[PDB]
Design an enzyme around this catalytic site. Sequence first.
Site, PDB file in Angstrom:
ATOM      1  N   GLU A  13       0.795  -1.227   0.000  1.00  0.00           N
ATOM      2  CA  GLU A  13       0.000   0.000   0.000  1.00  0.00           C
ATOM      3  C   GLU A  13       0.832   1.284   0.000  1.00  0.00           C
ATOM      4  OE1 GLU A  13      -2.237  -1.325   3.419  1.00  0.00           O
ATOM      5  OE2 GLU A  13      -3.952  -1.883   2.186  1.00  0.00           O
ATOM      6  N   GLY A  79     -12.311  -4.790   1.640  1.00  0.00           N
ATOM      7  CA  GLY A  79     -13.289  -5.792   1.205  1.00  0.00           C
ATOM      8  C   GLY A  79     -14.623  -5.108   0.954  1.00  0.00           C
ATOM      9  N   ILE A 153     -12.400 -10.686   6.712  1.00  0.00           N
ATOM     10  CA  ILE A 153     -13.762 -11.174   6.494  1.00  0.00           C
ATOM     11  C   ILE A 153     -13.818 -11.928   5.174  1.00  0.00           C
ATOM     12  CG2 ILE A 153     -16.207 -10.536   6.235  1.00  0.00           C
ATOM     13  CD1 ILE A 153     -14.989 -10.030   9.054  1.00  0.00           C
ATOM     14  N   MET A 173      -9.224  -3.297   8.346  1.00  0.00           N
ATOM     15  CA  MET A 173      -8.716  -3.621   9.679  1.00  0.00           C
ATOM     16  C   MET A 173      -7.964  -2.470  10.350  1.00  0.00           C
ATOM     17  SD  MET A 173      -7.556  -7.540   8.640  1.00  0.00           S
ATOM     18  CE  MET A 173      -7.158  -8.093  10.284  1.00  0.00           C
ATOM     19  N   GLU A 174      -8.059  -1.266   9.789  1.00  0.00           N
ATOM     20  CA  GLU A 174      -7.277  -0.111  10.265  1.00  0.00           C
ATOM     21  C   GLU A 174      -7.970   1.263  10.260  1.00  0.00           C
ATOM     22  OE1 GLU A 174      -6.270  -2.038   7.487  1.00  0.00           O
ATOM     23  OE2 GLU A 174      -4.898  -3.382   8.535  1.00  0.00           O
ATOM     24  N   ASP A 197     -11.308  -7.215  -2.957  1.00  0.00           N
ATOM     25  CA  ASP A 197     -12.101  -8.443  -2.873  1.00  0.00           C
ATOM     26  C   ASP A 197     -13.505  -8.071  -2.401  1.00  0.00           C
ATOM     27  OD1 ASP A 197     -12.260  -9.040   0.281  1.00  0.00           O
ATOM     28  OD2 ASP A 197     -10.254  -8.275  -0.218  1.00  0.00           O
TER      29      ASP A 197
HETATM   30  C1  LIG Z   1       0.848 -12.893   3.601  1.00  0.00           C
HETATM   31  C2  LIG Z   1       0.176 -12.282   4.814  1.00  0.00           C
HETATM   32  C3  LIG Z   1      -1.289 -12.701   4.897  1.00  0.00           C
HETATM   33  C4  LIG Z   1      -2.241 -11.654   4.321  1.00  0.00           C
HETATM   34  C5  LIG Z   1      -3.042 -10.965   5.425  1.00  0.00           C
HETATM   35  C6  LIG Z   1      -3.938  -9.916   4.795  1.00  0.00           C
HETATM   36  S1  LIG Z   1      -5.109  -9.258   5.935  1.00  0.00           S
HETATM   37  C7  LIG Z   1      -5.990  -8.040   5.013  1.00  0.00           C
HETATM   38  C8  LIG Z   1      -5.250  -6.699   4.930  1.00  0.00           C
HETATM   39  C9  LIG Z   1      -5.810  -5.793   3.834  1.00  0.00           C
HETATM   40  N1  LIG Z   1      -6.648  -4.792   4.544  1.00  0.00           N
HETATM   41  C10 LIG Z   1      -7.921  -4.475   3.917  1.00  0.00           C
HETATM   42  C11 LIG Z   1      -8.835  -5.604   3.488  1.00  0.00           C
HETATM   43  C12 LIG Z   1      -9.045  -6.035   2.178  1.00  0.00           C
HETATM   44  N2  LIG Z   1      -9.954  -7.053   2.123  1.00  0.00           N
HETATM   45  C13 LIG Z   1     -10.395  -7.346   3.360  1.00  0.00           C
HETATM   46  C14 LIG Z   1     -11.336  -8.280   3.979  1.00  0.00           C
HETATM   47  N3  LIG Z   1     -12.017  -9.161   3.220  1.00  0.00           N
HETATM   48  N4  LIG Z   1     -11.490  -8.248   5.340  1.00  0.00           N
HETATM   49  C15 LIG Z   1     -10.807  -7.376   6.119  1.00  0.00           C
HETATM   50  N5  LIG Z   1      -9.931  -6.495   5.634  1.00  0.00           N
HETATM   51  C16 LIG Z   1      -9.714  -6.445   4.297  1.00  0.00           C
HETATM   52  C17 LIG Z   1      -6.777  -5.201   5.953  1.00  0.00           C
HETATM   53  C18 LIG Z   1      -5.455  -5.879   6.190  1.00  0.00           C
HETATM   54  O1  LIG Z   1      -4.407  -4.912   6.339  1.00  0.00           O
END
Ligand SMILES: CCCCCCSC[C@H]1CN(Cc2c[nH]c3c(N)ncnc23)C[C@@H]1O
EC number: 3.2.2.30
Lengths: 229, 229
Positions: A13, A79, A153, A173-174, A197
């Site tokens: 980001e 999301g 989620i 998440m922030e 997503d």
């Molecule tokens: C290799 C490491 C494993 C990957 C972990 C990714 S967690 C999702 C990210 C991206 N950000 C936004 C986001 C994007 N999509 C989301 C969703 N479906 N639910 C909650 N948060 C989000 C929140 C958070 O900073």
Amino acid sequence: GMKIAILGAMSEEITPLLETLKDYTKIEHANNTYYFAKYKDHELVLAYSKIGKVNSTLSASVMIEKFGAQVLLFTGVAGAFNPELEIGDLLYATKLAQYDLDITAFGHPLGFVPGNEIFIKTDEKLNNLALEVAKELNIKLRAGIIATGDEFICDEAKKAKIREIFNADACEMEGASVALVCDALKVPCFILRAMSDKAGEKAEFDFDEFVINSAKISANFVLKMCEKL
Amino acid sequence: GMKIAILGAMSEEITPLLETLKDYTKIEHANNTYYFAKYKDHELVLAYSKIGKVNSTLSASVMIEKFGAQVLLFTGVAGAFNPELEIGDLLYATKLAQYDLDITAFGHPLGFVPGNEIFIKTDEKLNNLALEVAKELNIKLRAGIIATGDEFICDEAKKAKIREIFNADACEMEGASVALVCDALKVPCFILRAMSDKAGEKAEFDFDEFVINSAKISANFVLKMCEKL
Ligand SMILES: CCCCCCSC[C@H]1CN(Cc2c[nH]c3c(N)ncnc23)C[C@@H]1O
Ligand SMILES: CCCCCCSC[C@H]1CN(Cc2c[nH]c3c(N)ncnc23)C[C@@H]1O
């Protein structure tokens, strides 16, 4: 010009901004790296916080309390909940809530604790500036409500529940945590998210496929806002 | 003497210290009040953060980054998981995790995000000082693991699950976040909790009945630690 913080959660980001800026200095602080650059008469401080509410709260607090940021722009992905949003679409938050802040055992609503409100608002002037930038650059920009919590989620039932309770257009998440910090410290805050997503089944796979590109879309936009500040 | 932060979540956890100190100055900052007092050659900064991870993260960050705290002692109450704990018993955390930080969709364990660990440790020297104080004052003091998240736990199933996954002796809504901030900013951290309830059915009623008294037990102890620092 003012001192501007640009904050994301993940390297994906913020790294696109560093690549555009090219020349910057680093400081190691708060088990992280904070980047400093001059851009169009503004001093910038940039960082990615690492994922989630605690990490993002700490980084926003550091950027303001230690590094003197006077405005904060958050950039990243999210999301999508609102079915009119597609992957890649930009959404700025008018207000945000923590869907997983829960003292409902004591008869208060979900997202509430005493002394605070359920929703935290972002800065009206920054939001209007974003609308001007979007029109000037012919970029589609939607206003909405963001629900923040410490879960990724990827479940249609959870998505539907959070959407219903908070009238939320997207999750992440922030955002609510960063917006809360900025409000508390009297710093104008803008929260921008590009959809990666749709937060249902296979959200993890869409996130993996689209995070890099969606992150660039959001990053480009906040840098354009810096030009007009 | 060093600059010491004493932090709680609720008024009940900090007001007993303010009443003991008697003379202090107040500063309005970060949508909260921060209290300043001299005690036994130490400059104290005190506050209650308001409930939960974001609020407590912000207060810890403010106390260190803005007000220059060099050590941080957290005082308050908790929900007991370990059946050997009774209401009123003191527990200090050797390490803490966030049970509701969840990116398990990506195949990582609960409580983990990249760049961080599942458990954050508290300061060994402060923990040993607490053991010395406990012996000197004939106070029973237990060491354990604390699970932190943004829910008031009052459900035997949830209690059992969090206990099992993290081997946690108690739960609360601020410890792991405060400990993370302190670790990140290289400030020795001590997290003390007095049990207010057993985090099952009727935990809300036990919390209401015992919070004031249990909060005083923890508050008294951290002030005694300040004398020896
Ligand atoms: C290799 C490491 C494993 C990957 C972990 C990714 S967690 C999702 C990210 C991206 N950000 C936004 C986001 C994007 N999509 C989301 C969703 N479906 N639910 C909650 N948060 C989000 C929140 C958070 O900073
Ligand atoms: C109208 C009345 C509203 C009261 C809301 C109180 S939430 C519980 C407090 C007390 N503190 C520790 C704690 C004590 N007991 C707990 C439990 N069972 N679950 C989670 N946390 C705790 C965390 C949090 O700061």
